[PDB]
Symmetry: C2
Subunit: 206 residues, 2 copies
């Protein structure tokens, strides 16, 4: 049997209305021995509020057992270590994993918006670009909106490591050319821990 | 027992007839006791004999890594021929076979667009020249920057991202001194892709 431990979703850690969680995933749990016991530590201190998700039976005659611990936003942001100890008969010894926020001094994303190329104006849909650079760490959420409402049709690159040790990405929003020509304002909104108040939004229009 | 990994050629190598595309069959965890590895290669099922075994590499778990490199023909790879590596070794219960080939689906020509620095960026010492490459398939591509005939090397390129229409896009970012931009220095982003005319296109960016 084998153990993986996953951090919270970056957006979950920055929203007042979301509750972030750390997840401990146990694979290769034998049919003969299903009882997995989890112990959870916040900075080496046991906590008790985890909940075991219902087993999933993998099709190589083994179970997957998952344990989810809700965490406090500031706890995660403050860089506390979460430890998952996994006990089970089919293991000779308990397996222990630990996770925390990426280490390194935070760096503020610069956010710039770039209008479509003139050459793209040959097409029926055009690309609005948002460049997000100089950020650390890579936990970030990017969205587009207009007139108060989310835009459906955008895609964001993964963070890419720049040569100064910070990250950058681009977000591309696609819109009907006529919406761009009519003067509509589009906005790129970025959430990141090292932004002031963890949020910024940048707008563009013709 | 050993395990086997088969790697395709580099995008650039398949696109330029001056370069040498290769498929690479990598055998890991070859034991000390049974170190001899045999490869047979097949192109669409026809055995070929030109593969070359690299010198044995030593792994730090008391094991060897053995690598075979097959030179392939450019049009073969791009025509979607299947490359099969059969790996035989005494610690294997049966030989191991792996196959690779170009992703399937009608190629699509990338659109290449250069976008200047944001006005808001112009307060900094260095500015970002951006190249948007979109609408391409398959994801095999190479992207470079030039200025005044010589390579500009201070760039990074995102991996391809799957777009919501089933094609790919990426962006490449070249970092240059603000001063070089403001003087009207001409930069160009070159893209290499199978679906381009002569596998190559270049687009200018300049104040």
């Amino acid at each position: 049997p084998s153990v993986f431990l996953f951090p919270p979703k970056p957006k979950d850690t920055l929203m007042i209305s979301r509750t972030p969680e750390v997840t401990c995933v146990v694979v290769d749990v034998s049919h003969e021995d299903p009882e997995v016991k989890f112990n959870w530590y916040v900075d080496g201190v046991e906590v008790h509020n985890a909940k075991t998700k219902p087993r999933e039976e993998q099709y190589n005659s083994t179970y997957r057992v998952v344990s989810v611990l809700t965490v406090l936003h500031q706890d995660w942001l403050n860089g506390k270590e979460y430890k998952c100890k996994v006990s089970n008969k089919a293991l000779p010894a308990p397996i222990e994993k630990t996770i925390s926020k990426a280490k390194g001094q935070p760096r503020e994303p610069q956010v710039y918006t770039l209008p479509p190329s003139r050459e793209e104006m040959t097409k029926n849909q055009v690309s609005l670009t948002c460049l997000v650079k100089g950020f650390y760490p890579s936990d970030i959420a990017v969205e587009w909106e207009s007139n108060g409402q989310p835009e459906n049709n955008y895609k964001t690159t993964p963070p890419v490591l720049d040569s100064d040790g910070s990250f950058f990405l681009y977000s591309k929003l696609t819109v009907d050319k006529s919406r761009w020509q009519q003067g509509n304002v589009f906005s790129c909104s970025v959430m990141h821990e090292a932004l002031h108040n963890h949020y910024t939004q940048k707008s563009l229009s013709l």
